[PDB]
């Protein structure tokens, strides 16, 4: 599909660029000595300031499918999000919040999704005092080297599972996948109750082996 | 129980300290102008350099139950981990990796758990271009204010579940929690296959409402 | 009257503090080194971060009548205005833009008045190549030491000039105050044409001697 | 006429260059990595230090019609002004004062007009507490985007206004421009009193529509 | 007589302070960690910034008889000189030039004497390649511990020498001093030719033993 | 004749390099960005550290007729003088002392002549309080633009002036030059008494017009 | 045999290279402007950071026979040691401790020998207060310039000394070398007592003339 | 006994201060920040410049028995030694060289012992490629914790071994102390040949157990 713009260069954007091999990535960063490390990683570099609307227009924010924003501080992130929203009002913005109090301002400033790494890291370090399985789970289902994968499966138009409850479904027994949550629109219901009924076009979040994902996609086919 | 010693001060340790109200926390940091925000957060401050062994022993590393190491770089994190392993060989160390490739260095140095925030953040960025339910799941099951809580329930000795396989157990149909992982020792097996057999002392990693957690704890009793 | 909050300390906020002798001023800046010069200037210093919503609540932004924002860059200025609107949505915010591009972004973020000094100075330089009377007008009518003063005189409800046009009124002939503009709400009509009619509740932006202003105030009375 | 030399590159001299499109301008700056921004604005770059008299004469200060000085500090602005006054004692120098107390020293150094933005911006931020009509008047009549423009007209020799007082002339009543000041040489009388007689050579500073300005040039002709 | 004010502290003003024991010296410098060595040297310290006109008046510039200006750079030396000329127009200023080409800027700014150490020492080096008697002459007649002393003797009114030419005077044969220069006003004429005629008020610059100086003043008395 | 080495680059050596035009000069300095300003001034640049005995050997200290030493601090100057004296024990060393106490150590370390600018400039500023003719005399006879020059004339073998006293000589009357001092070997006698007798091979230090020096050299010829 | 990798460039590793002329050595250093000094010493330069495991394997650490680590701090030395222990767990690592308390942490990180110069130099400066014979012994037997050299000899299989005690052997009485220590594997017995029996494989550490060393190799032969 | 002066503070002078517990030590360094760590280490701090002859006289260099010089570079070390020899020409100076070239320059400047750590460490690294028993000898015999100690035992006048050779004496057989060197004045004879004869007043540089040294001391008595 279309290209992806990454505003700023840090460690989070480096791992995002490592997992975005194959698609087209434009990196818009300020320093000129990052050109070798961006161009080595398989993405074109655009020298400029990410808060200026002209340099955002240079790096082709308009036709992109999502713009990933991570600058050095949090105020520059809010500035770049406002600049992107003056350019385009439909492009997807993914931001990085450095402090916990700024997530509401980063959502009201226009970002579609705010990822706070330090709050995740703090809660994982607070939860690894007694026994450390939560951090192992979160760091293994997001790694593209394990046997289990956390994927989204979509409900097609006119599937076999339209309107039937999840207690009458038993997706885990016949497909072998773990259903951790269902998604409709911009809301997510983790561990749905027995009375939840599926709709057409839903997004089901599941963890399972790849052949179990194939049995799931063959199970909810039309 | 005993106390928790935090070496180094960053936003990760701040968000860890917000979740650790109710225990006794000794914070050890090189800067003295962070003393007011540590003492405001219900934690004790110890001035010193965490890389040095004497300034570590100022902050009671021996009688601690877990030490949380997040310093300014990765070299200081490795040096502080080795300084702690010089003091007590068996204390639990939870590190934090600033880059990706130093996770193996931090596990060779002596840390029992390496939590890399930037890798989780980058993979949650790259898995949120199309649809971002995964970021919502990861950031919502950790916060201890929502309706669903991910906990660890151990299998006690003399249970009704020892030797019984997971497909014979049917814990999701009875208790209401979702068995997303079984851990025994330091190994975590996500999505256990149906031929897996439980034992006494294994840890069940599940997500569920607190009523379902009480029902699960009443389900595995003797 | 109520107090005035000044966020950030720089050369613009210093010269505003001289013209605000007589009221109570809280100065909210990050560096401790400016505590001496503010307290000699007659304002209670509050050590805090102006971008933080907690430290803004210390400085009594809620009961204040105006908040003057001038921070070290325009990204931190936009961050501070969003923090104020998170606290109070009806307070008056006077900002300062550093570059020309950010004036539209600063007003959509919530500022009622954007006073950009580098646009005023950059256009007074290029209009002073030939002969400098534009800069001699602006820099003399604002200082409270010249013979003339540019003041704002309101029209009370029930005035003698309610509904009469500006040609039949003849303000400069009967009083001597030069009428350079009339304002209604958030609009200013520079050099109003002779078909414009007055209304009760209007403001008169005029230049004149103080005795001429006293001749204007009793003239527009009921 | 001749060219215009700009000593130093800052945000004030950047927006002096937008109003100086069409003329020939040399920018004398120390930093080498501003060379792209000067050339994109339509101005030649001369690399050198503006305080050195050799590097001034590289940028052709002898034949210029005005030199615009805005350096990083008030010390280097005064040092650069005396470097120009060693070259040519007849050229016109426009300088920018950072602080208020260095205005009178920049005039003794030889500058013909000192434009201090932080005293203008500081006085506009204090007059915009109650109602922001002063800052709207300044930032509109200088911008060449709105209708009314503040222009200067001279009185030529043998004019119809030569020897006439301002109460008999009634310039606003016939032409339609607002005469806010009339200046002889290097003085300016804002709101001229009724006993002021016009003389040949005085500069009338007026505000009006461009149709009203052309009527003023025909009203004062020979 | 009156006091001497020294602005700025360097190695030049330290050796000036050793030769000025017996008068009252007010040292004005920006650093406070030089307070011990000034008060040890028999001089009073005033903390402040010498470039500011208010912090000059702490150090009593008006009633002084000479101000000695040696700051950290050459731009600071000019901006301090112009502050003194704003305070008192007729006080004597002895500057010090760090470079060669800024000697003319310091005389335009208002200094009555520019003493460049790096030009004197830079010309004493290249004149000491072959034989260094010229470096020995300059450094020994200034030191007030040797046997020969270079002094200035003024010609009083009503002398026996007024109108008498130098070749008729024969001062070297009678007094023993060497008339190496005659100064009247601000001009110094080194090696006066034989047709030169003295006047009352002229200054005789001569070198001689302390016995020969007392004979010279008795030679030119009434 | 042979070449001259200048160890170090500062303001003193630049004024030494302006008067060494025509002769061969090697400059040995540490920074690589001074290569433009030395090669523009007419001398070859040798990149290296002046304290290393190898880098002194690169700049050809051995065959030079004098080596001029001026480094950044006084401690490096004693190091560079000791480094030269291990190489050659007959080459002429001219140093620059930054402080007054270091002059005695710089002579015992091996420099033939120590030039202290801050003691010269210190004693000129203390002597320019009353009247400034001492500083005007030193800065004109060392400048190669005046009418009078301070030169060194040698006594040839078998001159007319051999053995005769200076009272019987009357050099000032018949040659027109001012005799300020005589030099034999490494000693200098400023203002010799009447009983001083000339020897062959002396260096006489005199100030006079250029034709007055030619009358001097013709007078003391053989 | 194989090559030798040197991680980092300092004055210790500079003088490791003078003793390693003739072998093949790679120097891994971050700074680019040391490349000429490495190449002039007879060593290949590999540009890169020694803490990164990629930039180590560029410098061929897999096949080396020893790696010498001396980085700017003790933190980066421990981080670089664990970078080598991730590559090859069998290579020999020689490291330098800056401080004394970081010796035991460099041994836990994996270094086979920690050479701390500041503890050796600190103990020689305390033993040279009374008489400086300790510091003369160390700095002579290591230098390959004097006559006596401290070399190591192994005891091969089936030797004449195999099974003999040190009082019966009388090595100094027959060969002439001074046996100061004999070491088995990774231990060393300085001044071995009389009941020490030699075994096959022990390393005899002795001091003697090169004629005496060859007599020792014949005395212990098979 | 008398006191010890330590000029400059670094890691070498810290480890010397540990071995000097029991005497009085004055530490003369520039930075105020090391005042706390010296006073905890048991030495009276003196704030001063070690290169200055005035501040050396504060630290009682005259009555001292040894002055240990280790400053931040070798140029300041040579400067400080010349200052001590300007004060006292008979005091004992123990220096520290940073590079190999300066060891001859440091001893001609007046130092009695130059202990260069980077020459010792750089030659212990290259002798530890094969097997590290040289570094295990030096770093263990100097520490005052091992079983053996390298001490100096003098020969008193009138001893039993005055005039006997080293072969007829048989020191290692009758006592057990290994004789590694004998010293006379400023010379050390490592591995003395059998034709060397003893003298009264000699020093014995030996390695052995403390009971063996007590067996040596009563053996060489009169
Ligand atoms: Ca970031
Ligand atoms: Ca847990
Ligand atoms: Ca499964
Ligand atoms: Ca961190
Ligand atoms: Ca997704
Ligand atoms: Ca449930
Ligand atoms: Ca500002
Ligand atoms: Ca104009
Ligand atoms: Ca400026
Ligand atoms: Ca107002
Ligand atoms: Ca009009
Ligand atoms: Ca008027
Ligand atoms: Ca100076
Ligand atoms: Ca000469
Ligand atoms: Ca005389
Ligand atoms: Ca210098
Ligand atoms: Ca004088
Ligand atoms: Ca003459
Ligand atoms: Ca090192
Ligand atoms: Ca000793
Ligand atoms: Ca021997
Ligand atoms: Ca023994
Ligand atoms: Ca050192
Ligand atoms: Ca070896």
Curated annotation (Swiss-Prot), chains A, B, C, D, E, F, G, H:
Give every RCK C-terminal domain span. 138-222
A Gene Ontology molecular-function term? Answer: metal ion binding
- Binding-site list for Ca(2+): 70, 96, 98
Compartments in which it is found: Cell membrane
Q: Which UniProt keywords apply?
A: Calcium, Cell membrane, Ion channel, Ion transport, Membrane, Metal-binding, Potassium, Potassium transport, Transmembrane, Transmembrane helix, Transport
Q: Name one GO cellular component term.
A: plasma membrane
Q: Does the entry feature the keyword Iron, yes or no? A: no
Tell me what else is known.
It is not known whether calcium is the physiological ligand.
Q: Subunit notes for this chain? A: Homotetramer.
Domains (record comment): The channel is composed of 4 repeated units, each containing a transmembrane pore part and a gating ring part. The gating ring is composed of eight identical RCK (Regulators of K conductance) domains, in an alternating arrangement of one domain from each of the four subunits and four from the intracellular solution. Two protein interfaces between dimers of RCK domains from the pore-forming subunit and from the intracellular solution hold the ring together. One is called the fixed interface and the other the flexible interface. The flexible interface forms a cleft where calcium binds.
- Name of the protein this chain belongs to: Calcium-gated potassium channel MthK
Complete-protein stretch covered: 115 to 336 of 336
